């Protein structure tokens, strides 16, 4: 992703549920919905 | 000739496992899709499981997903299925049929080729 | 998931006749439908894809047409070869499923 990081304002870490590291392609099993909006310096994240 | 011949049927006991196997030919068969279709006689035809291209992604039906692997070597030219736990409810036809690309979605064109079909019975 | 439910069941018209077959999916699956023709004991054969797009080395008397989630397998003019069981499966979303299956025979 990244080569190296400058200053930084802010930094956030969270759980530590694992993910789905393999390759498979099916019946979509599970539905993430995302809305990404700044408003007035806000990073507003909404999700499902 | 494209052709599938599938071999392994029988007649198995319950909890009883068999593999069946389908051999491909006339295509490039690492480059496609393999799936497995039964039909159970006095039910229809039903999808059991599918394999993508590189062997790794794998879908199965629900009522098989434990007892069901599908697995496939590109070299041998031969797909197969590995049942356990048969169940009266398995008997069935079980034939291989060449899936098409699901990434084609909603131009998806079906499973052109199939083969004979073996059958397995499941019964004490 | 999805349901395909064919109609209907069983069917009987003479040889040269128009007959029509309808599929009825749950949900929009859009175009990923496609036929399948079965004989007794025999493998099934795929007549059409993405709804309309005829297989290779099918009969031309086939054809099949959809929008929505209704579609049609029509047959222009029946044969005695036409005997069989028709399927209509949606590929559009997993599990794959296929309908109950129309049994179509030659009408004496």
């Known amino acids: 992703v990244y080569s190296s990081a400058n200053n930084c304002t802010f930094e956030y870490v969270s759980q530590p549920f694992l993910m789905d590291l393999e390759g498979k392609q099916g019946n979509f099993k599970n539905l993430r919905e995302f809305v990404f909006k700044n408003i007035d310096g806000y990073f507003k994240i909404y999700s499902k | 000739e494209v052709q599938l011949v599938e071999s392994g049927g029988g007649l198995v006991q319950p909890g009883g496992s068999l593999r069946l196997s389908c051999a491909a030919s006339?295509?490039?068969?690492?480059?496609?899709?393999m799936n497995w279709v039964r039909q159970a006689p006095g039910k229809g035809l039903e999808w059991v499981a599918n394999?993508?291209?590189?062997?790794?992604?794998?879908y199965y039906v629900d009522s098989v997903r434990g007892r069901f692997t599908i697995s496939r070597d590109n070299a041998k030219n031969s797909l197969y299925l590995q049942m356990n736990s048969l169940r009266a409810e398995d008997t069935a036809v079980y034939y291989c049929?060449?899936?098409?690309?699901?990434?084609?979605?909603?131009?998806?064109?079906?499973?052109?080729?199939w083969g004979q079909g073996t059958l397995v019975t499941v019964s004490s | 998931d999805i349901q395909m439910t064919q109609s209907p069941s069983t069917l009987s018209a003479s040889v040269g006749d128009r007959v029509t077959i309808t599929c009825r999916a749950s949900?929009?699956?859009?175009?990923?439908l496609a036929w399948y023709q079965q004989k007794p004991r025999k493998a099934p054969k795929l007549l059409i894809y993405?709804?309309?797009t005829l297989e290779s080395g099918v009969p031309s008397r086939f054809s099949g047409s959809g929008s929505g989630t209704e579609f049609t397998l029509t047959i222009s003019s029946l044969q005695p070869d036409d005997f069989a069981t028709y399927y209509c499966?949606?590929?559009?979303?997993?599990?794959?499923?296929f309908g109950g299956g129309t049994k179509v025979e030659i009408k004496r």
């Open positions: 949900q929009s699956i859009s175009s990923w």
């Open positions: 006339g295509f490039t068969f690492s480059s496609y899709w």
């Open positions: 499966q949606q590929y559009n979303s997993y599990s794959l499923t």
């Open positions: 993405k709804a309309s």
């Open positions: 049929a060449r899936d098409p690309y699901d990434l084609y979605g909603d131009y998806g064109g079906t499973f052109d080729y």
């Open positions: 394999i993508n291209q590189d062997g790794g992604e794998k």
